[PDB]
Ligand binder design. Structure first.
Ligand SMILES: O=C(C1=C(O)C(=O)N(c2ccc(O)c(C(=O)O)c2)[C@@H]1c1ccc([N+](=O)[O-])cc1)c1ccc(Cl)cc1
Ligand SMILES: O=C(C1=C(O)C(=O)N(c2ccc(O)c(C(=O)O)c2)[C@@H]1c1ccc([N+](=O)[O-])cc1)c1ccc(Cl)cc1
Ligand SMILES: [Mg+2]
Lengths: 12, 230, 230, 13
């Protein structure tokens, strides 16, 4: 269930 | 209060990880009516991404749990009801952003770059709604997302270079929308690959102020393609 | 069958990192007037820890940003005001927990182990209050923390085994209170060492059910002593 | 801040 990258990205 | 104080405050909230506050400050700034500066635009985007992001994670977790407890029943209804509550928070958040977008942000955008940014943003927030939409309302939301994206896409090809971060970011998200929202991996891969290839073809249009973001994004496109072409 | 549901919902909330929900659920459980189980009280503990722990992290960040602002009095000022906003939330959270303890938890604690747990907790929440206490009120608040921690200590020395996790955890936090609040590193160190040594002396008192936790907390005590000793 | 003194309960990482 790996979700591909989108921008902006969530803060670590 | 003063717009300048609200921006400093937003910056403060960000550092303190109080995203609800950040978003409040930035929404207020936007509500003053003057066109946002590049910095204010990105702070707004940051605040809302995190705020809506919290709920998106929560929804995923609970959805996950609700599907795994299938057969348990009493718990399932517990999860269903909670998931629903989270969904409502989410829509409210999304409805706030979209309203900002239609009444203040997209109308006041006087340069192609910000117009594209905001239209992408519109595509993104409708995308988030499509994810938790009632079956009856879903199609309408998906078209509304696609439309916003489309429009931004057109403007970008015409007014921006293929290496522009915002053009690249749009392509990244638009393609994800095709993969994840329309279940059309062909168009998602096509859109991404093309965009990456065009950025690669005009590598000489990289700017001093933005070559780092461009290549990071190029690489994000690659990550998605690889992920999808395996 | 609401109480079971609330506990189910609290766990769901915890998994979804929605701590405000979790604590609200647990507060309702408490307010029903029946003595909490070990699971219930620990859920409550964690929920409120996360809720108050966010404001503490935030307070730290802003305080430090506010103090590293050598100039820019308008920035600094704004930081101060924001800090005060955060402090108020924290006091409210603290006061909520304290009130539960005073009204429901401590009064109905029928075994020493529960009594110690809740008294420790009272000490902790008063300690948090002391960290953001206004000069004129600080002494009383500090005293209330110390009094609570002291009562629990006395009870634990008398009714419980030196390897009991709750007894060990109390020593851990009480020692930290001395170090951090009363600025007494020597007492902080003395209390911690005494507790570790006593546990070690009665290592045969470890139980099937608690031996992982006892040892884990003993390591924590050592961690603090090593950091303070060096 | 450096290494901070531990207290219980601890925050979820
Ligand atoms: O954090 C980031 C960024 C900033 O802090 C910032 O200032 N960016 C940026 C750059 C070029 C620009 O022309 C403008 C502008 O005028 O709006 C903004 C970055 C940015 C890039 C894309 C989007 N997007 O909408 O897809 C948003 C933001 C960032 C985060 C992840 C990655 Cl892999 C790269 C950068
Ligand atoms: O997660 C934990 C724990 C639990 O999940 C749980 O149930 N604990 C526990 C055990 C024995 C007990 O007698 C009672 C009881 O009387 O309620 C509780 C643990 C516990 C231990 C100490 C405290 N403290 O505040 O001092 C709090 C909680 C845990 C977390 C970190 C560490 Cl390094 C060890 C354990
Ligand atoms: Mg536990």
């Amino acid at each position: 269930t790996i979700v591909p990258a989108t921008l902006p990205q969530l803060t670590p | 209060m003063d717009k300048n104080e609200l921006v400093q405050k937003a910056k403060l909230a960000e550092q303190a990880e109080r995203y609800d506050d950040m978003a409040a400050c930035m929404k207020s700034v936007t509500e003053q009516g003057a066109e946002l500066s590049n910095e204010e635009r990105n702070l707004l985007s940051v605040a809302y991404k995190n705020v809506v992001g919290a709920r998106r994670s929560s929804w995923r977790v609970v959805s996950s749990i609700e599907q795994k407890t299938e057969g348990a029943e009493k718990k399932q209804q517990m999860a269903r009801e909670y998931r629903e509550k989270i969904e409502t928070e989410l829509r409210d958040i999304c409805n706030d952003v979209l309203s900002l977008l239609e009444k203040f942000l997209i109308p006041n955008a006087s340069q192609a770059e910000s117009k594209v940014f905001y239209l992408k943003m519109k595509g993104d927030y409708y995308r988030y709604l499509a994810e938790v939409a009632a079956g009856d309302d879903k199609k309408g939301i998906v078209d509304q997302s696609q439309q916003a994206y489309q429009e931004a896409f057109e403007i970008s090809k015409k007014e921006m270079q293929p290496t522009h971060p915002i053009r690249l970011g749009l392509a990244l998200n638009f393609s994800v929308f095709y993969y994840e929202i329309l279940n059309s991996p062909e168009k998602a891969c096509s859109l991404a690959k093309t965009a990456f290839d065009e950025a690669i073809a005009e590598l000489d249009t990289l700017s001093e102020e933005s070559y780092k973001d461009s290549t990071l994004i190029m690489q994000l496109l690659r990550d998605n393609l690889t992920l999808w072409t395996s």
